Amino acid sequence: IQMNYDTTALLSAPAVQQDYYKLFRDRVLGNKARITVRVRSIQPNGRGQATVR
C-alpha cells in the first residue's frame, strides 16, 4: 500500500488526493484483511472522461 498510496496521489489532483488520503482502511483492513482489484473494461466517453468497469 505505501506504493499504491503514493502512486494514487501522484495520479490525482489535490482535491482528489485529499479525498483519497481521508480514506485512511489502515485500521479496518490493517494487516488482518486485504483487497484485490481487477479491471474488466475501460471505455473513454468524451473530453477528459471515461468509464471503468
Binding site: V39, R40, S41, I42, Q43, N45, R53
Partner: protein
C-alpha cells in the same frame, strides 16, 4: 450484447447510445423501416470485461 464470428469464441460488448426521434419520414422506403423516426446521434461500443 454479445457477438460471434462464424465458430470463434463469443465476445461480450456494451454500447452507449445517444438518441432522439425525428418523427415520421416522408418516403415509402423509409416509413416501412423506421416510422417512428428513431435516430442515433452518438454511438460507441466497448468490450465488456467479464
Amino acid at each position: 450484447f454479445t457477438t460471434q464470428q462464424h465458430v470463434e469464441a463469443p465476445q461480450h460488448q456494451i454500447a452507449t447510445i445517444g438518441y432522439t426521434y425525428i418523427g415520421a419520414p416522408m418516403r415509402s422506403s423509409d416509413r416501412l423501416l423506421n416510422p417512428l423516426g428513431f435516430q442515433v446521434t452518438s454511438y460507441r461500443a466497448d468490450p465488456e470485461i467479464l
